[PDB]
């Protein structure tokens, strides 16, 4: 059924699975109109489809043109996500198709399930975790390709850079969620922490800095402190 801390390690076995997060699919800025009323303006968005075992991130970018003349966009967004994930799966060779798709939000289950009727053997599951994938647009190179897109466009990343050369998928997933959780709770500090020392660079083909094993421990610790801190500043403890 659903996914939680008890069946946490299943993510890193050898059945192919993807997480889908639709948080950043429909994005708006809210502003006032000349008549003093409120209106929204949509900005480009994206579907966040991730293989937690490999790091492969299927970033499907959602251009604002997809909303033109549409009503009830928050509901459409969930169905648009489901269409794109289904289209993604269909485009994959059978041996690359996932055996499970875990949605980060329960509202996506019916839309995806209905779009996936042709794949009765692919399990669509929710999860009880509070995964921080919505902070993916706090990742500069992701935010950039999304905002610059002029048309629908799929872009492939490895969200773990070359980490799997030195660590396991389990540890790689733990680092990513720690980073993203930090970015979600205090973007400014989260980023100050990652980029203070201009002598650690981000290779052109990576998303994150090229930290050494020891430097990553220090990073990971400082991100923990930030999350606790922000939890105090927030809860006064």
């Amino acid at each position: 059924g659903a996914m939680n801390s008890s069946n946490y390690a299943e993510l890193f076995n050898n059945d192919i699975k993807l997480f889908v997060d639709d948080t950043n699919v429909y994005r708006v800025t809210v502003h006032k109109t000349f008549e003093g009323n409120v209106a929204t303006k949509a900005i480009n968005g994206c579907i966040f489809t991730l293989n937690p075992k490999t790091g492969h991130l299927f970033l499907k970018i959602i251009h604002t043109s997809v909303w033109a003349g549409q009503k009830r966009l928050s509901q459409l967004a969930k169905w648009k996500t489901a269409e794109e994930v289904s289209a993604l799966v269909r485009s994959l060779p059978k041996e690359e198709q996932p055996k499970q798709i875990i949605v980060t939000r329960k509202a996506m289950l019916d839309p995806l399930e209905v779009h996936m009727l042709d794949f009765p053997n692919i399990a669509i599951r929710p999860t009880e975790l509070r995964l921080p994938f919505s902070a993916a647009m706090s990742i500069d190179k992701l935010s950039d390709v999304v905002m610059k897109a002029t048309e629908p466009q799929m872009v492939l990343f490895n969200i773990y850079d070359d980490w799997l050369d030195r660590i396991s998928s389990y540890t790689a997933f733990s680092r990513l969620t720690l980073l993203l959780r930090a970015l979600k709770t205090n973007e400014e500090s989260a980023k100050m922490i990652l980029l203070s020392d201009p002598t650690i660079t981000i290779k052109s083909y990576h998303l994150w800095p090229s930290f050494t094993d020891e430097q990553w421990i220090t990073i990971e610790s400082q991100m923990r402190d930030l999350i606790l801190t922000e939890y105090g500043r927030k809860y006064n403890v």
Binding site: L76, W79, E83, D110, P111, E113, V114, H115, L117, D118
Partner: protein, 300 residues
Amino acid sequence: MNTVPFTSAPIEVTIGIDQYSFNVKENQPFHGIKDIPIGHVHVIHFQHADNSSMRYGYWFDCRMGNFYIQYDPKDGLYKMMEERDGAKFENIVHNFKERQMMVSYPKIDEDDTWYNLTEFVQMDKIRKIVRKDENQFSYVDSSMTTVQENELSDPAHSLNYTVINFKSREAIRPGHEMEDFLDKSYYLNTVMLQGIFKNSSNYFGELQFAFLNAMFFGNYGSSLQWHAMIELICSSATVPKHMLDKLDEILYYQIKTLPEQYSDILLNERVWNICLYSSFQKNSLHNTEKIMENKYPELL
């Protein structure tokens, strides 16, 4: 007016005839039910004093033959049986009447309840859902499962209902996924009413048949079927005005007749709050909504 004689009543039993019922005592001298209105389908049903487990009964149409009941002490139940010797049947009946050992089907003349609960029930279709071709009447009980309960295990004793499934390729046209799941009019109007039922009167018939099996036998799978056939209309934006009106009448009498105490197991909160308040037809069931609000406001 027809008669459904009983050979005897060896065990204490509650007997039901349509929406009536009366208690018969172990070896009380009972010989059947007289004055049954011809022209409708009927159900005669049983619940043994000893074992309130297993309500069971028989759908039958008097125009299709002469039927009687005889207790079988091997199988332990009141069985329906057909008499082909017509004279033997008129003769047996006449003797039991002259001695007045039959209760009278007790229809109040103002009362249209039975007609209103069975307007579209067809006996020959019933036979093609409770498959058993060697009898003109149809046995149902509490525990019989449906074809779709068996997709999720004895097929001869199943209720072959019209399978409805809202996440199924039948129900969802490719490329119309969002549209067909949020507005089921294509599944209702083309897939079911035009391709399977043939017409709405047939849609109402199975719907009525499901409810009664639910109400009279506590058959859970028939309850599911009744709510689904309702859900499919309530979730369709484009329904013929005349179907909506008849459905409002249909449900009104179903809700009127439901025991006030069985509401918690026989009514599905989700489906009703959709029909009445959330869905396309929220403004289209005035009679059904009034009676549900005044009789079962707790459910909503």
